[PDB]
Every structure is written in structure tokens, then in C-alpha cells.
Design a protein around this ligand. Structure first.
Ligand code: ZN
Ligand code: ZN
Lengths: 306, 306
């Protein structure tokens, strides 16, 4: 038994990370096949950050300059393209460690693992959720830009995230691997504005089933209802609304535990107005929303096949 | 910025894990140089678990039998020794992926990363603490036995833990890599008895400094005291006592924040009788004790050098 916020093993990603340097500046990058992917503000000089014209910043940039390192080997950049907010470089040598990779643009609420890197080397791995306002509540210091987020459900690596900014509010924003920001943000070191961050209802419910599976009963009470009375409470407390689409996703956990999705909503209803709050569930005094129904199945049972 | 319970990157350990099978049964094992290390109850048959005589169970065991696998390659066990509660096998091929490794017997309160594995392959990675009663509150299902815990502070892998039992109470117990159990436990599927699990005071304080560093001030109050009045409260609430040895360990964080260890104890005093408890610190409503002072420095700043 047990329940932990676990990350995917990072081995396959560690062999893809490089130290990228241009003009001066230096940050992390992602070496697949023979292309390096990295944030485009790698080419930005300081005052540039406050108001950059990337097209003009870069049309100057030396090819044959962006300096790329990797342990005891430095990659001779040939040449260069800018895709949206990333730069792609078509360097001299191809990563023998490129695994089956793909690219994904996940949607708010999905979870992924982040390999935080400095000076191109691994620092740590943690499991995080894309918020409904398209931010991440992360852990990144100077030089972590270019660190990526990923899944290896099976057959490896769905790259889904690349870190770019720390917002003035302390939250983190970035792009998919074709350079499209998640959310209303730019790579400008200027005033921004993220949504209201709401709690991911479907994940909270998956977490309640994981608790029942692990011996947490106390909050299963003798009520229930359908999901307009729930939804009409779940949003005064700013929880995203539950749809029949979320209900279908929870089915297997319902079949596991013999507990109807709707009856679980009932105790969640009361937990908002009475229950939670210090007797803890799975050792926490808050309701946690960084597990998908899929994370609960993978872990807790469905942990064999990659 | 940010604060996350992060694990060490697991790449260097993933290449050390094998699927081990004997009599029947099958569990995880650890391939370094050309020796496999695994729990000795690998050789145990079912009824055996309830009352095993390992010396007699094994003196029978076929050499030339323990079956070991690894992707598309199976290792031809030569032969075999039992060290305390592990078996060491001196197999036919040597792991080209053995990195600088060492062995450590960490002490209660230290933290490490666990790579949970099934059928010899990676499943997930999480960051955990050895409790003062020498248990771990983990996440392990059937077949995870042989999964290891490790650090890679720098120059890689201090192996410190190998999983053996799930206690009837739901907690996990295991050994160091020479087979010496942590705590009062045996590899017998019988009645046991773990200590009272107390909160790791020094870690809680490190976590408070991490919070101050990340913009949590509210709990710094205008009190203080020396550490007999603290210790005399910290143990009614069953926190291990704070020593001058813990004080010295916190110095750098004191020098970082300009906050004396003793003044931080003061707010911790009050938090026990008034403060904590729903306005959260670093987004939690409980006091967390799974960060060492060293984890706070590594992360949050001291993240460069391996
Ligand atoms: Zn940057
Ligand atoms: Zn076992």
C-alpha cells in the first residue's frame, strides 16, 4: 500500500539535456535527434528582456555562435530557426539517446513530471499540475529556463512543457515544444495577469477514491445528490464544474471501490461545508488536486506495463 | 522561486535494476559491477513467509537457478551468498552502467529518493523520510520488494535502503545494502511493532526557513526563548528534542535569512499552541518534516554543483 505524489523516472530525459549559450547568456536546452530546442530569450541582453524585438534581436544573431555543451562535448551549431517562442538549432551531431519521443499540448488539469536543470545538468524531479489558469506552481531558480516537463506513460516521452518565465506573482509559465505559450503570457519581463486559479474537481474526486482504496472511510457519509446541486456548490468555493465527461473518466475507480461517482460528490459537498479540515485524508489537511484519475490507476494498481 | 518535494533524478539507478526470480517467486534486484543484490525472501515459498528458516531454505537452493532478466538479456547466475537479509549473486556479466556508487546506513530523519519498480522496470520516483521509528511511509504494491532508496548528492549514488516488508499497519520496512534491517523488524510475515512515530523537529525548522525565503512571514512573531522551554513543549506534542547539534546545522539558513535559530523555535512553539492550522505555510496546513536543512540549501539555492 501507500500513496505518494510520484514522478516519472527521468533517466530517458536526462540524456537529452544540454547547456546552451548565446550572445552571452546561458540556459537549458533539449537535444533530440540532432536539433536543440530552447527558449528564444537565450539570445536576449538584459535591457532586452524588458521590451524585446526577437525578430530584430535574432536576424543579427551569429549562426555559428550559439554555444552548446554536454558533459565533455560541445556541439557545433550549424544553424537556426525560431518557432514561435523557441529556437531550433540543427547541430552537427545527433543525440544517440533520442528515445521514442513525441510532442503534446496537454490541457489544464493534466499532470506531468518536471526535470529541473541548472547549467545543463539534472537537479531534481517533481510531479506537478497545469493549473486551470495555465500556470504551474513550481520550483525554479536562476538558470532553470529550458527545463522541460514530460510523461512516459509507456513508450516514453511525451514532452509537454518548457519553462520560460517566473511571473512577478511567483508562479511559472512556459510553452509547449513548438513554442506556443500556455495561457495569456509572453516572454517579456513585464506586467502580466494570470487567471483566478481554481481547484481541479475531477482530480480531487480521484484522490478521494485513492483514499478509500487506502483505508480512508470517515468522509463517506449517508447523503447524496445529482450534479447540479454539487456544481452549484462546487463553484462558490471556486471548483471547476463537473461534467458527465469527468463522470465517465471516474467509472473504473467507481467499479474498483463500489462507490458511485455521485455519492462521492456528496461527501465532497459536505467536506466543503464540514468534514476535511484536520483529521486529514491520506495524511493531508487540504484537498489535493494534483492527481488525475489516471495517476490513481497507474499507481495504486495499474503499475505494470510501462 | 518555489518549493517542491523533489526527488533526485533516477537515471543512474534505472540502469541498475533487474528482475530476479527464484524457486518460483520474482522481485526486484540491484545489479552493480557483476553482483545482484536482492531480498533474501526471494527464495521463500508462501507458507515459508510465515515462519522461514532461511539457512535451511537456501542450503537447498539451486545455484544455477535464480533467474535474472533485464530487458532482452538474462543473467546466468553462477553463484550465491546470503549477507544478513540480502542475497548477493556473482553473475556472468558485469553492469557496464555501474556508476560511482557507495553504500550508506543513514540515520532516522535523513531523506532519500525511492525508485519504485515492478517486474524489474521503473515505475516512479518520490522523496521520502526515514521516520524516527525507522519506518518509511511509502507507496509499494505487490512485487515492489527490492526497490531501492538512494541519494546522488554529487558523484552519484549512495544507496541507503532496500525495501522488504509492508507492515500490517500499512508502513514499510527494509534494510541497508548489507542486509541490516532498519529498526526492530524481521523478514517474517508475522506480528510486529514499530515505535511511536515522532515529528522531526530539525527538519520542520529547516522548512520554516525555506518558507521565509519564499515569502512566508506571518508566523514570525515577537517572542522567543532558549531551548529548554521549547524542548519542554516540543515533546508533549511528540517532537524529537532539539540539540545544539541541530542548531549548528541550521546556521547557514540563519545566516541566509538573518533569523536566529532560537527565534524560529519561538514561532514554532506558538504554532503548536496557535498559528499554523489553515492559513498554510508553503501551501500546506500541516507542518512538514520531510526536508532536511540540507535539502533546503541544495534546492532553493545551492543548486549547481552536482
Ligand atoms: Zn530565461
Ligand atoms: Zn517480498
Amino acid at each position: 500500500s501507500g500513496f505518494r505524489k510520484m514522478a516519472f523516472p527521468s533517466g530517458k530525459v536526462e540524456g537529452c539535456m544540454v547547456q546552451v549559450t548565446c550572445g552571452t547568456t546561458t540556459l537549458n536546452g533539449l537535444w533530440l535527434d540532432d536539433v536543440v530546442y530552447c527558449p528564444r530569450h537565450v539570445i536576449c541582453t538584459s535591457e532586452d528582456m524588458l521590451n524585446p524585438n526577437y525578430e530584430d534581436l535574432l536576424i543579427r544573431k551569429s549562426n555559428h555562435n550559439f554555444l552548446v555543451q554536454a558533459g565533455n562535448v560541445q556541439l557545433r551549431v550549424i544553424g537556426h530557426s525560431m518557432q514561435n517562442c523557441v529556437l531550433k538549432l540543427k547541430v552537427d551531431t545527433a543525440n544517440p539517446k533520442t528515445p521514442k519521443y513525441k510532442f503534446v499540448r496537454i490541457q489544464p488539469g493534466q499532470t506531468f513530471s518536471v526535470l529541473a536543470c541548472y547549467n545543463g545538468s539534472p537537479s531534481g524531479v517533481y510531479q506537478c499540475a497545469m493549473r486551470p489558469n495555465f500556470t504551474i506552481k513550481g520550483s525554479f531558480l536562476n538558470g532553470s529556463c529550458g527545463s522541460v516537463g514530460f510523461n512516459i506513460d509507456y513508450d516514453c516521452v511525451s514532452f509537454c512543457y518548457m519553462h520560460h518565465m517566473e511571473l512577478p506573482t511567483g508562479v511559472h509559465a512556459g510553452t509547449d515544444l513548438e513554442g506556443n505559450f500556455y495561457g495569456p503570457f509572453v516572454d517579456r519581463q513585464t506586467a502580466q495577469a494570470a487567471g483566478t486559479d481554481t481547484t481541479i474537481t475531477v482530480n480531487v474526486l480521484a484522490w478521494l477514491y485513492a483514499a478509500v482504496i487506502n483505508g480512508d472511510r470517515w468522509f463517506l457519509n449517508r447523503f447524496t445528490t445529482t450534479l447540479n446541486d454539487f456544481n452549484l456548490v462546487a463553484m462558490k468555493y471556486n471548483y471547476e464544474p463537473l461534467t458527465q465527461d469527468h463522470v465517465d473518466i471516474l467509472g473504473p475507480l467507481s467499479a474498483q471501490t463500489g462507490i458511485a461517482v455521485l455519492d462521492m460528490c456528496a461527501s465532497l459537498k459536505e467536506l466543503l461545508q464540514n468534514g476535511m479540515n484536520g483529521r486529514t485524508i491520506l495524511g493531508s489537511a487540504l484537498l489535493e488536486d494534483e492527481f488525475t484519475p489516471f495517476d490513481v490507476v497507474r499507481q495504486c494498481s495499474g503499475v505494470t506495463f510501462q
